[PDB]
Amino acid sequence: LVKNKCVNFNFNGLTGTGVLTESNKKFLPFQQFGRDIADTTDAVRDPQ
Amino acid sequence: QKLIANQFNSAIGKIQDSLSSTASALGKLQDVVNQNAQALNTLVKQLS
Numbered sequence: 144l145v146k147n148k149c150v151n152f153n154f155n156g157l158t159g160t161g162v163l164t165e166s167n168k169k170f171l172p173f174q175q176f177g178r179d180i181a182d183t184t185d186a187v188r189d190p191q
Numbered sequence: 192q193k194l195i196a197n198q199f200n201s202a203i204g205k206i207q208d209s210l211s212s213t214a215s216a217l218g219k220l221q222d223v224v225n226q227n228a229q230a231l232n233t234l235v236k237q238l239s
């Protein structure tokens with residue numbers, strides 16, 4: 144993975160393009176994805 | 192002159208206190224923001 148760059152990610156099937164950045168603020172106890180009020184993915188956990 | 196000045200100053204103080212105390216004194220402005228936010232949220236939610 145390359146961060147701080149407009150890439151075309153694919154984590155376990157889910158697609159999308161964007162800039163992947165460090166998100167140490169968000170805490171995922173056991174969940175996989177992330178979501179917003181407008182129901183859009185905003186943070187993903189790296190399977191690697 | 193003295194009485195009118197005192198009444199005016201007291202009225203200014205009273206309106207300042209009333210604005211600072213009550214919470215529902217600015218509905219006519221919050222309603223527009225809430226309506227626009229609702230419209231945008233519904234438009235985004237239509238994607239799914």
Ligand SMILES: *[C@@H]1O[C@H](CO)[C@@H](O)[C@H](O)[C@H]1NC(C)=O
Nearest residue numbers: 144145154187188189190191
């Ligand atoms: C699992 O991921 C870690 C991450 O550093 C890596 O060190 C380790 O080698 C991986 N396991 C295997 C079996 O490759």
